[PDB]
Design a protein around this ligand. Structure first.
Ligand code: PCW
Ligand code: PCW
Ligand code: P5S
Ligand code: P5S
Ligand code: Y01
Ligand code: LPE
Ligand code: 9SL
Ligand code: NAG
Ligand code: NAG
Lengths: 119, 173, 1413
């Protein structure tokens, strides 16, 4: 599955960071079966923390590390699964992953963004 | 394929008679679990008494004396999807004259659907003492002799006419 | 100037310049044999070795003035350049340009480009390539750019008449280069769409390979001639699409919806909340294993929902929704599918099931008048274009060759010789030819369920034959010198084959070519002494790769191009969007993901199957992109296929082959040996006779005369025809519902009794009238005799004795032949039958060749797929078990032991022996049933092994090769010879038509003239001032053209009606139609006032007047219909009236009017054929409905399509008349043993037992039927159309000038003052000297005046009309109109001068002069 994300995303501290993610799946998005997991790891060999998941509906896990700054910013039926991180902080630097399953499409999609926080 | 034929309506005394009751399904490829019950209102009375019920390949006969013995199943065998529900009388007597009712109860089995249907067929049975030839055959035979004779006569007449004309014109010269 | 060789120098350039300067200061074509690209004429001799590949001065004088310079190759081809320095930089002397143009004109340069083009073509067929492919494609674009650079630098690009961009092929080349570079540097998202273009490098083959460009030009000319036919086709498809969209709008959305609904649910909520096949199966009624819901209907003759369901219009159309009549576009698609006859039987069945059976009429009309009439029209136009083109080329070739002729104005050698004798013996060769036949007939006894001893028998026999043939090959090689041996083609043929046999005997473990020995009987064509049919076929295949080798090559090229394009466009999609066209989420049988499968799909489209694969494509890749690619393949590919077919047909079967026939000087061993052995056998016969003889009443004549009168009369004949029709109907009444029709049963019995009596009486009368000789040396009388005999036999046995118990209950089935007594009665059928009988002897002569060809292919098939079509399937699902669970047959038997309803079954139609091999090939050749056999083939593993998916994938090659040689070539030969035979029958009977009676010819001659008659009568102008102007209006060309617009506008108004449109658009489209009705009625009224009564004189003005009325009542009536009565079915059929406003569109077209005219000329003949076809269908229906009425219903045989009634059977028979789905009907008949059929199944209401079929009868039925249909409908429709079309496009010759006859008369009065119409022969010599041209005859007149054979009346006098005829015939020539003009000229004279006594001729001027000399 083709997943389009910026490999590196550079955002100023305090600004809003939209993490763009779209995916080219031919099959129509069935909200009763579509799956999205947005995880976050500090490093390639570090632990992933799921922070948002679309299982039937948008589920924001409200991880303490993000406070209430995570928002969904996509539209699954339009093949957009982007998220928004409001008022970015230096600790938000790291790796963010968009996982995508669009049954009955066989292949799972994976986008990986390296978010860097500028002064 | 199944074909709904109607029963005959006249049975000869003392002989055997088969009563026809056929009810085909609308689409032959479906599954069913049909069972049937017969009732009979004897001429001179007004009510139908149940006489027999045929379910699960066993025919249970009522306690009637008019039909005690004298009747055997002659329908479909060993299927449970019964499409011909005919019965057969042996040793017909005068008491077996009147109306018959062939209640067919079918249960069609569909994908997620179970449709309990029912049909009724009315048959009128008259017991005569000796067979009567049907008027159709009689008039057909008669007309089939009339036509033969009239064709032969027309042909022979025209032939004699033509032959006279020919014999005339022959020695005219 | 044979020594015209002069290096184009600076001096020559200056001379050319001064020539041009002196011409431009004062202000023909070049010789076509001088033009560049030709070959250098021999007239100039050889080249000076210093001039070849060097700038020379232009030879053709037409360029002698202009600035050019030509260069000549070492193969004597011409290369005409321009002298201006290219880009104002490189003079023709610039060493760069010198050496460049030197390189350009070279053979190796072209061969290099051909090599690299083919290599790039090979590299394009990789679905996913590695990166070093990137490197080599860099190499490819480098080579292309380099050679293009040499061209642009050598020739010139900025300035000149012979420059680079001054040729379309260099346009193509440059386009390729620029696309390559631009995409290589900057790129977009859809990189596949970009790379798709690089396949034009394959098109560059046309440019580089010699000869092709001429072929492409020929194809483009052929297309240019296909102009009116395409318009007619689009117009007819549009009309039928409007009709269909009217009748069947929304019918295919009918579905069986369950009745009882739970939870207070409605249809609406349900349909809003369920989007999965599972749910629809829960709510609608699906036939098991199907993808679409079952279609139902509201009428009584449509589908039937099962009890508990009801018919409702909701949901989507079938076939993913691509099959419908809901909009104009979909209706157009469906009609196009019907025209090309692509799986049309399914559309037929669906529409009949959802609308009713009475709409069979729609499909009858469409097929014939659409499909059959248009294909033949296309065929005819292509054939005529090609024939004209070829004959033009050939007459030009005669002219050129004429011009060329005018320009000409020890002991080992001892036994070598003794062996030569033996090996050449006229008997040994015959022995070897019979040995070949014995060997093939030996191999043909190879069947699957074969005991081992049989196998060893066959092995040792094949070894014996190999020994024989190898020995004879060695003997030839030792007698005939090896070089002389390998000189002959058959020797090398047999050589290769026997060597391959030996090699495989070499235990080299090939086990694949041992079958190829079966190719050896083609040697029987040698000893076939040019068998009137065989050498024909061999020369077909020769012309294919020999003379016409430039066509097959083009076909291959375009097929390759399309395969690659399809792969590049749709492969990744096929892989990705896969679960949309296959539930198991694996690739379907026909995909486009790799080169081989895409090529197979393209090949399948050319064969004629393009609709199912197209539906699969439209789902994965979108509708528009897919439609365009398939239509281009369908249109272009079928065009080229048609071209190839017809080319060969005409080239190898017309006057061409019989012209220029040479004698063969070879005393064939066949004739020698057969004469020798005939003399021997006559000798031994004679000596055997020798040894045997040496050891040892007028009344009766009146009777016969009388019987002759009655049998001959007309009342008698008509009465007999009436009886025949009645008896045939009586046959038609006996279906499976005859039990409920009691009275009719008995009536028909006695009626049969009386019919038999009548016909026996007739027979006796004929006997007493004609007599036994005259009666029994007749052919029809034998037919009537046989029929009445079987009828009498059954009647007798049925009554006195055995009374229908033995095989009499099978003899009784021959009543179906009773309608055969009609053939003799009707002339329209006797003419067709006679022609077909005359053609018979040539048909059963190509049949032998076809059977030999198919025997070879069937032996090969039996050797490849003998018992490999078995499989272990799950009967409930119908699915093959995975070949990892059930590997071989024993395992399947263990599963049968344990589990239930699994079955190790085998395809009904397989390759288990040569008998079924023939049947299997018949389905492949007709493309009806072929796919299942092909799938079974590409999955075979071994004799008792479970098949695996596409294990033996390349066995597709086997079917591809066969279809080409069998399905395509055999059709050629059959249509080829048959069509010729008809042309030989016409010539025999005087060139008349062989498909019309004598009463139809009269009608034909009249409507031919009454169609094509140029002269007309001008209409007078009305007197009145208020009527004058109106007349000035209606006559203008302005007036007619404007109306042609309002007709097209009306057409587009009908085209925007769709299914389920707003109430608004219904009301609007209604009011628009009203306005159009007003306007055309107004036109009619204006015409009737300008033309007071002359309006009803024109044939077209009448057709408009009818359409006016019809359209109006269509408005009022339909309004009244729906309001106080209700009948939607009628409502619709009455709205078909408005179509008549569109038909007027053919009033302005001129090509269309001509093409339709050819149709009207063809109805008399097609009607006769239509009769004969109908009688055959009727006879088959009776056989069917009395043999196949109780078959299983397993497939193709459904509740609605079966042989249970006369209606159903006739419906099935009409379907398979075009062979569509005949395999489906046959399939449920070929099962004769449990657990397939139950031979003791009881049917309620009848007394017949068992639903088994009779395979023997079954096969003969269908095979014979589809054969008879091909011979009639396909080959006569082609013959009929072909003749009319030609005469349709023909004009008439009437160039006479009235003033010329006036001058003829005005001069006649100067010699005949008394107007006696006669003149003296001495004055005849000056009468011809006083006429003006063209009637002028220059002195001496006496030399030409005698040769005209002028007749002379008493007194050496000559009549005027004879002089006029003799003078008119010289200026016009011997034309066909000349005698018809002579016919009318004499007739008008005989009616004007009844005194015949004065016009008797005594002698002619030739005979008179012969008396003098
Ligand atoms: C050398 C050159 C040879 C000729 C090459 C060009 C020939 C034809 C080009 C045709 C281009 C068609 C473009 C269509 C664009 C399109 O996508 O339009 C959409 C419409 C309506 O689709 P929908 O919205 O109902 O989709 C709903 C999907 N559902 C209903 C299946 C569930 O599709 C439709 O009407 C289907 C329209 C089909 C029209 C007939 C095509 C012409 C056939 C024969 C012509 C003679 C040869
Ligand atoms: C679903 C569609 C439903 C709507 C259909 C509406 C129209 C249907 C039927 C209307 C038929 C009306 C009559 C047509 C024939 C009229 C006629 O008068 O035709 C005469 C011609 C011969 O007369 P002429 O042209 O030599 O007249 C001499 C004058 N001059 C030579 C100057 C032209 O005979 C011929 O060819 C007759 C050719 C007849 C072909 C009819 C085909 C109809 C389709
Ligand atoms: O051919 C010529 C004759 C045909 O008979 P025709 O009426 O005499 O000749 C026609 C002509 N108008 C004429 O007067 O000249 O035919 C001949 O002259 C040739 C003689 C035919 C020889 C065969 C004789 C068979 C006689 C018919 C068999 C009788 C069948 C008996 C019926 C069975 C019992 C009812
Ligand atoms: C409504 C339009 C009708 C046309 C009106 C114009 C009109 O009356 O004079 C125009 C024409 C005149 O020809 P005529 O009346 O037939 O008499 C001459 C005759 N036809 C003849 O052959 O001498 O008149 C006609 O064209 C009359 C024919 C009209 C068609 C009649 C059918 C429906 C009534
Ligand atoms: C001149 C004769 C002898 C050969 C003609 C061959 C052509 C018919 C082949 C070669 C190139 C092929 C074309 C290659 C590219 C395209 C573009 C393609 O459209 C797209 O790719 C759109 C892509 C997008 O929109 O993103 C449609 C098929 C088409 C016309 C192909 C149609 C078939 C073509 C013209
Ligand atoms: C040549 C063309 C092919 C042969 C054409 C023959 C003439 C055309 C023969 O067509 C017969 C069909 O139209 C019969 O279909 P029906 O729908 O009329 O049958 C209805 C039966 N019930 C339901 C009323 C009882
Ligand atoms: N399976 C096969 O033979 O493929 C060819 C093509 N495809 C079908 N699904 N068909 C349904 C029945 C049939 O005859 O096989 C056929 N009907 C036509 N017109 N061609 C056939
Ligand atoms: C109609 O539907 C409603 C659902 O809101 C249901 O409560 C009610 O019982 C239904 N009525 C009947 C008669 O089924
Ligand atoms: C099981 O199958 C075998 C044949 O493979 C048969 O011989 C045996 O009797 C069967 N036994 C049972 C349990 O039916």
């Amino acid at each position: 599955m083709e997943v389009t994300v910026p490999a590196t995303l550079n955002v100023l501290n305090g600004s809003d960071a939209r993490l763009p993610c779209t995916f080219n799946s031919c099959y129509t998005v069935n909200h009763k079966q579509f799956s999205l997991n947005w995880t976050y790891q500090e490093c390639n060999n570090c632990s992933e923390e799921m922070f948002l998941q679309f299982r039937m509906k948008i589920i924001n896990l409200k991880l303490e590390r993000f406070q209430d700054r995570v928002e969904f910013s996509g539209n699954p039926s339009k093949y957009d699964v982007s998220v928004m991180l409001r008022n970015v902080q230096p600790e938000d630097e790291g790796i963010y992953n968009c996982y995508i399953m669009n049954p009955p499409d066989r292949h799972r999609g994976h986008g990986k963004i390296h978010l860097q926080v500028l002064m | 394929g199944c074909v709904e034929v109607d029963s005959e309506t006249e049975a000869v005394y003392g002989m055997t008679f088969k009563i026809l009751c056929i009810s085909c399904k609308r689409r032959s490829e479906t599954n069913a679990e049909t069972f049937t019950e017969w009732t009979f209102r004897q001429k001179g009375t007004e009510e139908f008494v149940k006489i027999l019920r045929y379910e699960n390949e066993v025919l249970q006969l009522e306690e009637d004396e008019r039909f005690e013995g004298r009747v055997v199943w002659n329908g479909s065998r060993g299927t449970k999807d019964l499409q011909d529900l005919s019965i057969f009388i042996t040793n017909v007597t005068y008491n077996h004259s009147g109306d018959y009712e062939c209640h067919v109860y079918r249960l069609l089995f569909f994908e997620n659907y179970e449709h309990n249907t029912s049909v009724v067929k009315k048959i009128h049975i008259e017991v005569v003492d000796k067979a009567n030839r049907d008027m159709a055959s009689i008039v057909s035979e008669i007309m089939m002799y009339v036509l033969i004779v009239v064709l032969t006569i027309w042909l022979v007449a025209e032939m004699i006419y033509c032959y006279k004309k020919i014999a005339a014109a022959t020695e005219t010269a | 100037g044979p020594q015209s060789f002069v290096h184009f120098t600076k001096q020559s350039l200056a001379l050319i310049e001064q020539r041009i300067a002196e011409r431009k200061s004062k202000e023909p074509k070049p010789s076509s044999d001088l033009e560049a690209g030709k070959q250098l004429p021999f007239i100039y001799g050889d080249i000076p070795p210093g001039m070849v590949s060097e700038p020379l001065e232009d030879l053709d004088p037409y360029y002698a003035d202009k600035k050019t310079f030509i260069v000549l190759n070492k193969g004597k081809t011409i290369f005409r350049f321009n002298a201006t320095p290219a880009l104002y930089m490189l003079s023709p002397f610039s060493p760069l340009r010198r050496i460049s143009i030197k390189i350009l004109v070279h053979s190796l340069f072209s061969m290099l480009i051909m090599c690299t083009i083919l290599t790039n073509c090979i590299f394009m067929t990789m679905n996913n390539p590695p990166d070093w492919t990137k490197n080599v494609e860099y190499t490819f674009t480098g080579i292309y750019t380099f050679e293009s650079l040499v061209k642009i630098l050598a020739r010139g690009f900025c300035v000149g008449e012979f420059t680079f961009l001054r040729d379309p092929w260099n346009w193509l080349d440059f386009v390729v280069i620029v696309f390559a570079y631009l995409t290589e540097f900057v790129n977009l998202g859809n990189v596949s769409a970009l790379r798709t273009f690089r396949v034009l490098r394959a098109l560059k083959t046309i440019s580089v390979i010699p000869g092709l460009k001429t072929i492409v030009g020929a194809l483009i000319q052929s297309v240019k001639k296909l102009s009116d036919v395409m318009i007619l086709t689009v117009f007819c498809l549009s009309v039928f699409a409007l009709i269909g969209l009217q009748l069947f709008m929304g019918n295919l959305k009918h579905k069986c919806f369950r009745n009882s609904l739970e939870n207070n649910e409605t249809l609406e909520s349900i349909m809003n909340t369920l989007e999965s096949e599972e749910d629809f199966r829960k709510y609608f009624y699906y036939l098991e294993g199907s993808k679409d819901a079952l279609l139902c209907g509201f009428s009584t003759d449509s589908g039937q929902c099962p009890e508990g369901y009801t018919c409702v219009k909701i949901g989507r159309n079938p076939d993913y929704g691509y099959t419908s009549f809901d909009t104009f576009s979909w209706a157009f698609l469906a009609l196009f599918r019907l025209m090309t006859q692509d799986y049309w039987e399914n559309l037929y069945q669906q529409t009949l099931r959802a609308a009713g059976k009475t709409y069979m009429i729609f499909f009858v009309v469409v097929i014939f008048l659409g499909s059959f009439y248009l294909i033949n029209l296309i065929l005819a136009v292509v054939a005529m274009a090609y024939k004209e083109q070829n004959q033009a080329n050939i007459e030009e070739a005669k002219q050129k060759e004429l011009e060329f002729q005018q320009m000409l104005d020890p002991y080992w050698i001892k036994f070598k010789k003794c062996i030569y004798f033996i090996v050449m013996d006229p008997f040994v060769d015959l022995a070897i030819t019979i040995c070949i036949v014995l060997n093939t007939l030996f191999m043909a006894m190879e069947h699957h369920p074969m005991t081992e001893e049989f196998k060893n028998v066959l092995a040792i026999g094949n070894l014996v034959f190999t020994g024989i043939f190898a020995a004879e090959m060695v003997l030839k090689l030792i007698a005939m010198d090896p070089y002389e041996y390998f000189q002959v083609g058959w020797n090398i043929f047999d050589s290769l084959i026997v060597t391959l046999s030996l090699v495989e005997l070499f235990l080299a473990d090939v086990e694949g070519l041992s079958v190829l020995r079966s190719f050896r009987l083609l040697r029987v064509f040698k000893l076939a002494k040019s068998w009137p049919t065989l050498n024909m076929l061999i020369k077909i295949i020769g012309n294919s790769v020999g003379a016409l080798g430039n066509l097959t090559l083009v076909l291959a090229i375009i097929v390759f191009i399309f395969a690659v394009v399809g792969m590049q466009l749709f492969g990744k999609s096929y892989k990705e969007c896969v679960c949309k066209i296959n539930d198991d989420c694996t690739l379907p049988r026909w995909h486009m993901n790799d080169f081989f499968h895409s090529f197979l799909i393209v090949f399948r489209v050319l064969c004629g199957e393009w609709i199912e694969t197209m539906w699969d494509c439209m789902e994965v890749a979108g509708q528009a992109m897919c439609l365009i690619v398939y239509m281009m393949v369908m249109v272009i590919g079928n065009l080229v296929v048609l071209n190839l077919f017809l080319a060969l047909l005409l080239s190898s079967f017309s006057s061409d082959n019989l012209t220029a026939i040479e004698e063969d000087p070879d005393a064939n061993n066949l004739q020698i040996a057969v004469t020798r052995i005939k003399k021997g056998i006559n000798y031994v016969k004679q000596t055997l006779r020798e040894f045997i003889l040496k050891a040892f009443g007028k009344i009766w004549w009146n009777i016969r005369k009388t019987c002759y009168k009655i049998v001959e009369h007309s009342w008698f004949e008509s009465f007999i025809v009436l009886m025949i029709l009645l008896s045939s109907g009586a046959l038609a009444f006996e279906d499976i519902y005859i039990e409920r029709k009691k009275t009719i049963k008995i009536i028909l019995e006695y009626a049969d009794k009386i019919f038999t009596y009548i016909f026996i009486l007739e027979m006796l009368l004929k006997w007493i009238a004609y007599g036994y000789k005259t009666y029994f040396t007749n052919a029809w009388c034998w037919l009537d005799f046989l029929i009445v005999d079987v009828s009498l036999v059954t009647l007798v046995a049925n009554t006195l004795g055995y009374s229908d118990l033995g095989p009499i209950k099978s003899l009784r089935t021959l009543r179906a032949l009773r309608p055969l007594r009609a053939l003799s009665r009707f002339e329209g059928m006797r003419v067709v039958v006679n022609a077909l009988i005359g053609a018979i002897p040539s048909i059963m002569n190509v049949l032998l060749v076809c059977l030999i060809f198919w025997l070879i292919f069937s032996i090969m098939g039996v050797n490849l797929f003998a018992g490999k079509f078995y499989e272990c399937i799950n009967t409930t699902d119908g699915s093959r078990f995975p070949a990892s669970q059930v590997p071989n047959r024993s395992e399947c038997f263990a599963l049968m032991n344990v589990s239930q309803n699994v079955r190790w079954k085998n395809l009904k139609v397989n390759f288990d022996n040569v008998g079924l091999g023939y049947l299997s090939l018949l389905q492949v050749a007709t493309f009806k049933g072929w796919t299942i056999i092909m799938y079974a083939a590409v999955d075979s593993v071994n004799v008792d092994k479970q098949p695996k998916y596409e294990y033996s994938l390349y066995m597709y090659i086997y079917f591809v090769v066969f279809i080409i040689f069998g399905s395509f070539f055999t059709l050629n030969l059959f249509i080829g010879v048959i069509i010729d035979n008809f042309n030989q029958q016409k010539k025999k009977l005087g060139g008349q038509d062989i498909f019309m009676t004598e009463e139809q010819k009269k009608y034909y001659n009249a409507m031919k003239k009454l169609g094509s008659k140029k002269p007309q009568k001008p209409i007078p102008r009305p007197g009145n001032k208020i009527q004058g102007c109106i007349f000035d209006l209606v006559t203008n060309q302005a007036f007619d053209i404007s109306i042609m617009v309002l007709i097209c506008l009306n057409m587009v108004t009908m085209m925007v009606e769709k299914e389920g449109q707003s109430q608004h658009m219904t009301e609007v489209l209604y009011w628009i139609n009203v306005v159009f009705i007003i306007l055309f009625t107004g036109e009619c009224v204006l015409k009737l006032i300008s033309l007071r009564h002359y309006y009803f004189t024109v044939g077209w003005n009448i057709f408009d007047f009818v359409v006016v009325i019809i359209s109006i009542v269509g408005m009022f009536l339909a309004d009244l219909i729906e309001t106080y009565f209700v009948s939607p079915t009628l409502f619709r059929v009455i709205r078909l009236a408005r179509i008549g406003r569109i038909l007027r569109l053919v009033k302005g077209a001129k090509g269309i009017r001509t093409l339709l005219f050819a149709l009207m000329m063809s109805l008399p003949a097609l009607f006769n054929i239509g009769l004969l076809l109908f009688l055959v269908m009727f006879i088959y229906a009776i056989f069917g409905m009395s043999n196949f009425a109780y078959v299983k219903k397993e497939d193709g045989i459904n509740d609605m399509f079966n042989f249970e009634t006369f209606g159903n059977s006739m419906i099935c028979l009409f379907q398979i008349t075009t062979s569509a789905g005949w395999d489906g009907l046959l399939a449920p008949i070929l099962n004769s043993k449990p657990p397939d059929c139950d031979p003791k199944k009881v049917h309620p209401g009848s007394s017949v037992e068992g639903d088994c079929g009779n395979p023997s009868v079954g096969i003969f039925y269908f095979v014979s039927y589809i054969i008879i249909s091909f011979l009639v409908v396909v080959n006569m429709y082609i013959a009929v159309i072909l003749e009319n079309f030609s005469v349709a496009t023909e004009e008439s010759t009437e160039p006479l000038s009235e003033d010329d006859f006036e001058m003829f008369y005005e001069v006649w009065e100067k010699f005949d003052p008394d107007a006696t119409q006669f003149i003296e022969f001495s004055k005849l010599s000056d009468f011809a000297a006083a006429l003006d041209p063209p009637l002028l005859i220059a002195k001496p007149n006496k030399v030409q005046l005698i040769a005209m054979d002028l007749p002379m009346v008493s007194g050496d006098r000559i009549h005027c009309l004879d002089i006029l005829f003799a003078f008119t015939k010289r200026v016009l020539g011997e034309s066909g109109e000349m005698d018809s003009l002579r016919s009318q000229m004499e007739e008008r004279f005989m009616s004007a001068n009844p005194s015949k006594v004065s016009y008797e001729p005594i002698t002619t001027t030739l005979k008179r002069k012969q008396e003098d000399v």
